[PDB]
Design an enzyme around this catalytic site. Structure first.
Site, PDB file in Angstrom:
ATOM      1  N   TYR A   1      22.669  80.596  92.104  1.00  0.00           N
ATOM      2  CA  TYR A   1      23.999  80.813  91.879  1.00  0.00           C
ATOM      3  C   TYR A   1      24.076  81.900  90.586  1.00  0.00           C
ATOM      4  CZ  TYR A   1      24.891  77.322  95.456  1.00  0.00           C
ATOM      5  OH  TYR A   1      25.650  76.358  96.660  1.00  0.00           O
TER       6      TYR A   1
ATOM      7  N   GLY B   1      20.666  68.609  91.633  1.00  0.00           N
ATOM      8  CA  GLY B   1      22.289  67.530  91.251  1.00  0.00           C
ATOM      9  C   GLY B   1      23.211  68.131  91.146  1.00  0.00           C
TER      10      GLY B   1
ATOM     11  N   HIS C   1      17.351  77.010  92.725  1.00  0.00           N
ATOM     12  CA  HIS C   1      18.685  77.597  93.288  1.00  0.00           C
ATOM     13  C   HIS C   1      19.969  77.631  92.101  1.00  0.00           C
ATOM     14  CE1 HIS C   1      22.426  75.341  95.139  1.00  0.00           C
ATOM     15  NE2 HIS C   1      21.605  75.612  96.496  1.00  0.00           N
ATOM     16  N   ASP C   2      19.875  77.039  91.338  1.00  0.00           N
ATOM     17  CA  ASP C   2      21.005  77.089  90.084  1.00  0.00           C
ATOM     18  C   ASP C   2      20.522  78.459  89.825  1.00  0.00           C
ATOM     19  OD1 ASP C   2      20.753  74.712  87.593  1.00  0.00           O
ATOM     20  OD2 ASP C   2      21.390  74.256  89.245  1.00  0.00           O
TER      21      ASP C   2
ATOM     22  N   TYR D   1      31.279  79.821 102.744  1.00  0.00           N
ATOM     23  CA  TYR D   1      30.744  81.058 103.595  1.00  0.00           C
ATOM     24  C   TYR D   1      30.112  80.549 104.811  1.00  0.00           C
ATOM     25  CZ  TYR D   1      26.533  77.887 102.457  1.00  0.00           C
ATOM     26  OH  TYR D   1      25.579  76.653 102.092  1.00  0.00           O
TER      27      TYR D   1
ATOM     28  N   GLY E   1      22.816  72.772  88.273  1.00  0.00           N
ATOM     29  CA  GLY E   1      23.189  73.328  86.567  1.00  0.00           C
ATOM     30  C   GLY E   1      22.593  72.050  85.724  1.00  0.00           C
TER      31      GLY E   1
ATOM     32  N   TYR F   1      16.590  68.915  88.075  1.00  0.00           N
ATOM     33  CA  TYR F   1      17.196  70.633  89.025  1.00  0.00           C
ATOM     34  C   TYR F   1      18.408  70.447  89.984  1.00  0.00           C
ATOM     35  CZ  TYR F   1      16.794  72.839  85.027  1.00  0.00           C
ATOM     36  OH  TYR F   1      16.160  72.681  83.603  1.00  0.00           O
TER      37      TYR F   1
ATOM     38  N   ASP G   1      21.178  78.857  99.412  1.00  0.00           N
ATOM     39  CA  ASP G   1      21.846  77.666 100.057  1.00  0.00           C
ATOM     40  C   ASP G   1      20.940  77.144 100.503  1.00  0.00           C
ATOM     41  OD1 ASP G   1      23.490  76.234  98.426  1.00  0.00           O
ATOM     42  OD2 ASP G   1      24.404  76.527  99.914  1.00  0.00           O
TER      43      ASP G   1
HETATM   44 CA   LIG Z   1      20.017  72.294  88.931  1.00  0.00          CA
END
Ligand SMILES: [Ca+2]
Length: 122
Positions: free
Chosen positions: A51, A29, A47-48, A64, A31, A27, A89
């Protein structure tokens, strides 16, 4: 933006941080696919997902507002959507820090080809 995520990672984790983190596991890297390999990878999976919950702005691209002072990052700014990106983040960066004790070099630049199993859903 991911440029800022990178800066945030380097601030919090040290300058080796970007390279350490942004091709890790299934994960990190971004997406990613498959099953999170470990705690650090789960930070990136989270984190994905974080987002993915951002609506109204683009978490990869949009810039941001944040302050970095004495090793901690604080999200601010006047745009809640951008603050939401910043928070994804910031959380991931603190998650990396918290899980540094199980960071496993095996998963550094692990490779997508090792993550071809069904993806864990957000
Ligand atoms: Ca990922």
């Amino acid at each position: 933006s991911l440029w800022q995520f990178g800066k945030m990672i380097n601030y919090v984790m040290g300058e080796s941080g970007v390279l350490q983190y942004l091709s890790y596991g299934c994960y990190c890297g971004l997406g990613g696919q498959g099953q999170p390999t470990d705690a650090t990878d789960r930070c990136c999976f989270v984190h994905d997902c974080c987002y993915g919950k951002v609506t109204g702005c683009n978490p990869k691209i949009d810039s941001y507002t944040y302050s970095k002072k004495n090793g901690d990052v604080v999200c601010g700014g006047d745009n809640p959507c951008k603050k939401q990106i910043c928070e994804c983040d910031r959380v991931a960066t603190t998650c990396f820090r918290d899980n540094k004790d199980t960071y496993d070099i095996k998963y550094w630049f692990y490779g997508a080809k090792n993550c071809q199993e069904k993806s864990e859903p957000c």
